Symmetry: D2
Subunit: 438 residues, 4 copies
């Protein structure tokens, strides 16, 4: 019976790089009302989960492009407080935030999330990132650098250290015996004394366990070391794949990685992203999808493409065809995700830089756009789920808050009527909704 | 016209160490409903603000966990704030974030974030302290020297202020048709590079309608008052009578003036712990009850902490003069000598009782038992005698006493014209009569 | 395991006739914020039920001048809707009069509120006729009004059954909005009343609203016997509580109905204090505010009448003690639950919920959490 | 500066008869959340007003049975009592004006005076009452009224009704309530007067049990339409809900209502005329056009004929088109740019003081309207950005 999650940047773009220009986009990303509407709506639709990405710098891989146009991370509210905002005016919905292990210490993370877990009565989850981008570092004044795979080694200790902090109290530690004078059993709140290879945390956490026990672990995963890590730690996995073939592979692989780590593969829920665009008739929808992708300024997509590929494409003029870039530099010395994308996005065509950017801003090259009816969006979700594509689906928003209104009003009751999706919330915590253990 | 502010730890105790034991104490400090209630009530009561302190370690743990210890539970205040802001439209909100365990980018962003999510009602209380147990939680061990932590904070504040000016009024154009998201000319890098700190990129959050979050400052130390002088826009103080309130008050204003700033733009608050009854006699019985709940050891735990001296070394019997024997009268802290003198009236108190009394207020928070008329009278007399620009209603027990205070006291202050009826404006700067 | 109920006039007094004067009385009775607060607080304390009484009329020297009964009174149905909108479990009840409003009116309003509250509503049936109200609505014997109300209840109930579960379909594809064989004309035509067309409102998840009843007169308790699923009562001590209880129970059996399917509440008026003396000193404060004439306005339609309403027990205590007496009276068969008459508003319920409720829950005699989502489930009633 | 109102039946249909079938129709009309969203959303768009109509019986005028009305989405098939819904909406909003239809034929003046004074107080000055005087048989059989008064006489009786209502709303007077807790005076008894109304059609004695809101009196709304109706609107209506298919008829009706308000010794600008339009939005012109087609394809012929039967007063593809709008509600398919344009060009040519937005489907269309159209009206300066005042009188440019 299928999970659903939302996901969007607390700011100007998620995957659709024209979203902000959309006639129906509010741009209320500065305002609490915007986040409260979205979340309440996903709660209305009985979604498992809504979670926020994070980036700690305006992307400059100058400011002409990122700020002037609507570039990735140009506005980025701190996710945790927005998650808190959301949790206040909702009672079942799962809520998740990205917090980095490279820039934040384990005690902070341990507390931040145990607070939100308690404030929300067990509905919280942390998305563990480990990236050490430069543009982010220069905002945090961090220069120390550790190698990609070592960051995940560190992160393993990080998570062990946090888990200890979430175990520092224990079910039944907090008595509130006013009469007898006992605030809590001191035997049952132990020091952690985490002293290990990368991190020190001594004193116990100052937040007991929510009804949920611990926050739910989210992991992007993706890299080879990354999938060992998800394998060990992830309970829900956020994955972006452009078709059912790649979906199926990523799915089986995560499951293998969870099982190789000595875990139950059913206890780690894998989500793939899609970007639905609804119409009353299929034709409407297609026209609505054309509208949407037409808003993407070429330079902004290119900006993001540049960043993602790790190769400044501003260097070149916008008419430059792609093979002439693969010419100017080495056909070896040209990153592989990039050559892949440009074959796929053009289907064999030798696109100009602007076109390539235009299309990359559409999704982020790899998020399926599904233009359809509601019946058809439900069909496709059920087919993919029944085909082994994922345990649930992240719903990327074309524009906010409207598309989430559309999807919850239109597609959700169809999913419910067919029996493949939750009609009422059976439990109260996020761990119950994803069907996980303690 | 006088300002009113709430203040309580997002956890088990604030100043009144019996608060958790109290019969009307909900102890919903783990829950959103609790903080949503309290913040809504102070909004009903037309308060200027409600700010939270923060402490980053439970203060062995036998006493702290066992009884109502300082820090024992402390939710991270940013989230708790965010929560209150979501069900609230006028009430200003504040969080303590430390400059010592968090870089400038983090702080400038959270607060620009809450400041935007609350539509201009947020404030940052700047702490510079380095407690041992907190460092043991964040894996720091090397410690900067007290006066230097302020010289650092001076840089930190310069850089956080730069971040919040990185955007600028009316740079975010949302010109969908023309496809201009913002003015890249009107968004500049900071490229801060001073002695202890680097922060570059523009902050990824524009200014709220407020402009910048409002600066809070707890002041105390001689260096701190030079710092409060430069930076503080509101000041939180704890003086136990009118002479010290006056003294602290003019002192702060003199530091603000000395810094080339306007003293009228720095509101000074002093904390008072009103207890209410329908008669003065009932007030007194209700104050007696509350202070009756303080376990001596808990109070002592907190006093040990605040004095900068571990008092578990001596048994509970030990009278104070024998401690001032065991250690020299020059090798004993002078907050503790002033406390035992004031709290015992010259009596040579057992260490238990000495703690019991410290855990009642935190030694220095006026307890005022009164009727509602008397509380409004004491508030008004104090305000008119120059004690403070406003008051920190320190809560005896939660959430009850704020319900009592807003229903009973506020409207009286309102009928005398010494307090707002309706919030005139919408930002926390407007409520405090501050600029930009 | 014992039920709890709120009760207060949507206006200036309920039973403490000096309540408006109290230092803590907010006098929010005009404002939406007032009622939303109380309702939410009563839900916080896991109360079964909050309900409003009503009267349709207030020379005015005594009434308006000082704090009289009905001096101000907002129309209950709209206040109840205000409460339902910012709550989700707590049951809500209003008084509507069978003598000035037609069957269709009542049936549809309580069905609307039932549907709006997702099945939490209750109607308190009143058949009484007062001169001041008659002259306000432009207008029979006592016992005959109840013979009329018997017909009224049949008509309301038929109307509520006019739709039937799963009649509504919303088959957008097929274009069938509802099953017209499953929505039916009532065609009521009894001795006093005519009401025909189907009710324009289907049944809530509760099925029907919960019926309350005041009881009182010999013929009144026979009415409760037939119709009442919940029975507000006032008795000044346990002996009379005991007597009323069994009398009601016996009438219900006498009507051929399951006695424990009808829930008996007794009004008590707690005043809380942190110690027994504070409790008592607070009680002295409350009754000091009572004007002698004001009690006499209500008593006619003397000073100590308007302290309680002569008969509502004032229990001053410490929370332990209010918990003790709540339990002791329950265990001695006084009532299945307790109407908490409020000293002053909204203050007292903040006290009762914060202080007494936890203790009732610890000894394990009152719900910690709502097991069900309907008022029917909370009271352990059927369909 | 131009006004805007929401309008929909607290049930299954308003003007668009295929609405319940629409793919994005929540059909949450039984549930609290549905109304609370709509209110809050129209509040988000800075709307003057949302008001509910009311029908006191299922429409069984067509085919003599429930068959069509219940089996398809017939006029009034479900209809919640609107005074409750208004209070539900008011509980979670603070500026948005709220109006309920209540009937002078089946309810006494004391009832009406008090409910609306109660909602006025609870909403803190945002309430209005839409006065109706109809006397249908299906409604009478639900209420047991065998009696009948002729059309125009019903309005003569309505005149008294409103004289009596207003007396009751004057029964309390500002600063008569004084909660002098110390003194012991709950209210100045000399400033709460009896009404002692004893006219031709009605009696109502006592004072109203509910004082005046900050607003004073609820705003009086009114449908008008008939010769004697238009005179009544003239004397009493502070707002007027109208339905007109083209610009000529809009102005003509507009100028006419003004003349009646003038003819009754009143300021014509103190009565705001609103005309109904039914926008359908698209990101493109083509999309809007498609969306309007979809919508209107859902209208099942019989349900259109049924409401035509009712509206005309005669039992019975002609019905398909009538169910589209209600024959005469203009449907505008456009782009938001274009819808905002039409709103302005009509406003500027004196077609109306404000616009009723009739909802294609709920709650989604108002979500679209508010997100898309409102800001453009705002950005052009023809519509509220903030609420300048906090009462429905203030938003509408009205007095005491």
């Amino acid at each position: 019976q299928l999970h659903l999650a939302g996901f969007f940047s607390a700011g100007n773009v998620t995957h659709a790089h024209g979203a902000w220009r959309h006639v129906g986009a509010t741009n209320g990303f500065l305002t609490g009302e915007f986040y409260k509407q979205i979340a309440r709506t996903l709660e209305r639709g009985k979604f498992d989960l809504l979670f926020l990405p994070d980036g700690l710098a305006i992307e400059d891989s100058n400011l002409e492009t990122g700020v002037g146009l609507g570039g990735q991370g140009a506005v980025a509210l701190e996710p945790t407080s927005v998650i808190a905002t959301m949790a206040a005016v909702t009672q079942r919905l799962g809520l998740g935030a990205t917090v980095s292990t490279t820039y934040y210490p384990p005690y902070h993370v341990a507390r931040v999330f145990a607070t939100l877990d308690n404030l929300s009565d067990g509905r919280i989850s942390w998305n563990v990132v480990t990236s050490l981008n430069d543009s982010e570092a220069r905002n945090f004044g961090v220069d120390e650098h550790l190698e990609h795979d070592i960051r995940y080694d560190r992160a393993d200790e990080f998570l062990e250290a946090v888990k200890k902090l979430w175990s520092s109290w224990s079910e039944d530690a907090l008595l509130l015996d006013k009469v007898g004078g006992r605030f809590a059993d001191p035997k049952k709140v132990q020091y952690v004394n985490h002293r290990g290879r990368w991190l020190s945390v001594r004193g116990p956490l100052q937040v007991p366990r929510s009804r949920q026990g611990e926050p739910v672990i989210l992991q992007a995963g993706l890299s080879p070391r990354g999938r060992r890590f998800a394998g060990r730690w992830a309970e829900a996995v956020f994955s972006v794949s452009p078709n059912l073939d790649i979906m199926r592979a990523v799915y089986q692989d995560i499951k293998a990685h969870v099982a190789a780590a000595g875990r139950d593969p059913e206890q780690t829920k894998v989500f793939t992203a899609v970007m639905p665009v609804l119409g009353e008739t299929e034709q409407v929808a297609r026209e609505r999808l054309e509208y949407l992708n037409s808003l993407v300024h070429p330079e902004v997509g290119l900006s993001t493409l540049s960043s993602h590929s790790g190769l400044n494409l501003s260097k070149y003029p916008l008419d430059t065809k792609f093979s002439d870039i693969v010419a100017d530099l080495g056909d070896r010395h040209v990153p592989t995700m990039l050559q892949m994308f440009s074959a796929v996005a053009g289907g064999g065509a030798d696109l100009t830089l602007a076109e390539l950017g235009r299309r990359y801003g559409t999704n982020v090259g790899f998020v399926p756009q599904w233009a359809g009816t509601a019946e058809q969006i439900a069909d496709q979700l059920i087919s993919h789920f029944e085909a082994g594509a994922a345990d649930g689906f992240i719903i990327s928003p074309a524009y906010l808050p409207g598309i989430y209104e559309e999807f919850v009003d239109q597609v959700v009751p169809l999913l419910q009527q067919r029996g493949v999706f939750r009609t009422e919330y059976e439990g109260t915590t996020l761990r119950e909704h994803l069907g996980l253990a303690h």
